[PDB]
C-alpha cells in the first residue's frame, strides 16, 4: 500500500499568533530533541513503503513526527503550546503502540521523551 499524505503543516484559514511558549518549543525543545543521537527515526513521517511495513498505517491512524512538528512551529500553525505538546505525545505513544516494550526503537523514544519532559518542565510562564 501507499503511504498516507503527511499531516497538514500549514493552513491559511487557521488564525496565527506568536507566544513565548511556542518560541521556546521551537528554539529550545524541538532543537534539543532534534540533535539527540536517538532522534533520527523520529525526524520525518514513517515511510512504510521504503521500510516495508505493510501494517504501520493500519495500526497508526494518527501519525506524527518531529519533522511535521517543526514545520508546524515554523509556520505558526499552532495557536496553543498544548497543541504542540500533544503532538510530541502522539509521536511517543505511536512508537509505544506500534512496537513492543524493550524494543530498541522504544528505548530510543523513551530517551527522547525523558528529555522532552525535562525541557517542558522549564517552559516559561505564558507572557
Ligand atoms: C518512529 C518509528 C516507530 N517505529 C518504528 N518501528 C520499526 C521500523 C522499521 C523496522 N524494520 C523491520 C525490519 N526491516 C528489515 C527493516 C525495518 C522495525 C520497526 N520505526 C520508526 N521510525 C523509523 C524511521 C526510519 C527508519 C527506521 S528503521 O531503521 O527501518 N527501524 C529501526 C531499526 C530504527 C527500528 C525506523
- Radius of gyration equals 15 Å
CATH fold name: Histone Acetyltransferase, Chain A
CATH superfamily caption: Bromodomain-like
Structural class: mainly alpha
What count of domains describes the coordinates? 1
CATH level-two architecture: Up-down Bundle
Helix percentage range:
40-55%
The percent range for strand residues is: under 5%
**H and E string:** HHHHHH
Organism: Homo sapiens (Human)
Protein name: Bromodomain-containing protein 4
Subcellular location: Nucleus; Chromosome
Family: Belongs to the BET family.
Characterise this structure:
It is found in: Nucleus; Chromosome. With 127 residues, this protein is mainly α. It has a single domain (19-123), classed as Up-down Bundle (Histone Acetyltransferase, Chain A), CATH 1.20.920.10. It is built from six helices and no strands. The chain has helices at 20-34, 48-51, 56-59, 66-74, 81-98, 104-120. Helix 1 packs antiparallel against helix 6. The longest helix is centred in the C-terminal third of the chain and has 18 residues, at 81-98. Residues 41-42, 46, 51, 53, 95, 98-99, 104-105 line the site of the ligand Cc1cnc(Nc2ccc(N3CCN(C)CC3)cc2)nc1Nc1cccc(S(=O)(=O)NC(C)(C)C)c1.
Give descriptors for this structure.
monomer, 127 residues, mainly alpha, Histone Acetyltransferase, Chain A, 53% helix, 0% strand, globular, binds ligand 1M3, Bromodomain-containing protein 4
